[PDB]
A paper describes a structure:
We have described herein the reactions and the structure of Pgp3, a Csd protein of C. jejuni. This enzyme turns over the cell-wall peptidoglycan by both the d,d-endopeptidase and d,d-carboxypeptidase activities, as documented by mass spectrometric characterization of the requisite reactions with synthetic cell-wall fragments. The Pgp3 monomer is structurally divided into four regions: the N-terminal domain (NTD, residues 21–95), a flexible linker (residues 96–147), the LytM domain (residues 148–259), and the C-terminal helix (residues 260–273). The Pgp3 LytM domain contains a highly conserved tetrahedral Zn2+-ion-binding motif (H168xxxD172 and HxH249).
In order to gain mechanistic insight into how Pgp3 works, we have determined the X-ray structures of the WT Pgp3 in two crystal forms (bound separately to tartrate and to citrate). For the tartrate-bound WT, a model accounting for all the amino acids of the recombinant Pgp3 (Glu21-Asn273) was refined at a resolution of 1.86 Å to Rwork and Rfree values of 17.2% and 19.9%, respectively. Crystals of Pgp3 could only be produced in the presence of either tartrate or citrate molecules. Both molecules bound to the active site of Pgp3 via several hydrogen bonds and salt-bridge interactions between the carboxyl groups of tartrate or citrate and the Zn2+ ion. Furthermore, in the tartrate-bound complex, the side chain of His216 (NE2 atom) formed a hydrogen bond with the O3 of the tartrate molecule (3.4 Å), and the side chain of His247 (NE2 atom) formed another hydrogen bond with tartrate O3 atom (2.7 Å). The O3 atom of tartrate in WT Pgp3 (open form), which is the position of Wat-1 in H247A variant, is seen interacting with His216 and His247. Specifically, in the tartrate-bound complex, Wat-1 and Wat-2 were displaced by tartrate O3 and O41 atoms, and in the citrate-bound WT Pgp3, they were displaced by citrate O5 and O6 atoms, respectively. When the structure of Pgp3 in complex with tartrate was overlaid with that of the citrate complex, their overall structures were similar with RMSD of 2.95 Å over 256 equivalent Cα positions. However, both structures showed a large deviation (RMSD 6.98 Å) in two regions (residues Glu99-Phe109 and Thr159-Val164) near the active-site.
Residue numbers in the entry: 20 to 275
Write the structure that this text describes.
């Protein structure tokens, strides 16, 4: 198989006698195929930055081993040269401490795997507008990716109602330094949706939110060029192309 860097892929395997799916020594979790009871699924994601050129997964069964080969593709992402080197920025210590604490909190949240579905059918787009900044727009330094857009931006004047893309449990609902006012929803199976730069948060941590319920109002909080909604998906441990992910997920789980 082939997969563009920064995208997720739903791998299908036989359920019977399956033991484990591994990438080197890393275990990849599995979940049931919703329609074919003889099948299970796993989400494999390639990091946008510095991906391997190829990946070989091993599915271990009771009586056989299967190999899955995935070639990394570069895709057709927008890219331009970094005007100034991404040097060490030098924030005040109080800001450095906040950034580090919020990184630690986020890592803990994305490492807390929910082994059941919290979603309800297909994902919906969180608002009815249009993309203003595509996922995966990159800035390069000596033809090495220095930074990239890790979600997708939608046009939104400040105060635009934002709705949960799918049902789940709220894991972040607060102001963070870079993301601004942030909502992150766990959908199960290591799938998280992200809503950043909000002007108002209308949910609390731990809340079971239903698809299409209001989560807040769009804004321009945090690090932003102006008002908009930033929408992201983390799945298979990595930020992935969110609309591409929604299409692939919906092809499997839409109800039906
Ligand atoms: Zn963005």
């Amino acid at each position: 198989m082939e997969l563009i860097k920064g995208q997720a892929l739903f791998l299908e395997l036989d359920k019977k006698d399956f033991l484990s799916l591994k990438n080197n020594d890393k275990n990849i979790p599995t979940f049931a195929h919703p329609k074919n009871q003889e099948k299970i699924l796993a989400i494999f994601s390639l990091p946008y930055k510095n991906p391997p050129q190829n990946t070989k997964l091993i599915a271990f069964y009771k009586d056989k081993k299967e190999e899955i080969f995935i070639k990394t593709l570069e895709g057709n992402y927008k890219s331009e040269k970094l005007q100034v080197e991404n040097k060490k920025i030098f924030p005040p210590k109080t800001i450095q401490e906040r950034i580090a604490k919020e990184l630690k909190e986020a890592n803990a949240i994305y490492s807390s795997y929910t082994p059941k579905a919290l979603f309800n059918g297909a994902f919906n787009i969180p608002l009815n507008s249009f993309i203003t900044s595509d996922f995966g727009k990159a800035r390069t330094f000596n033809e090495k990716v220095a930074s990239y857009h890790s979600g997708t931006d939608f046009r939104a004047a400040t105060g635009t109602p934002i709705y949960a893309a799918n049902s789940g449990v709220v894991k972040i609902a607060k102001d963070r330094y870079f993301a601004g006012n942030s909502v992150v929803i766990d959908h199960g199976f290591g799938i998280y949706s992200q809503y950043y730069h909000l002007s108002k948060i209308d949910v609390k941590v731990g809340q079971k939110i239903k698809k299409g319920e209001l989560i807040g109002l769009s804004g321009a909080s945090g690090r932003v060029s102006g008002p908009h909604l930033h929408f992201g998906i983390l799945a298979g441990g990595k930020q992935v192309d969110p609309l591409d992910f929604v299409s692939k997920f919906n092809a499997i789980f839409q109800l039906e």
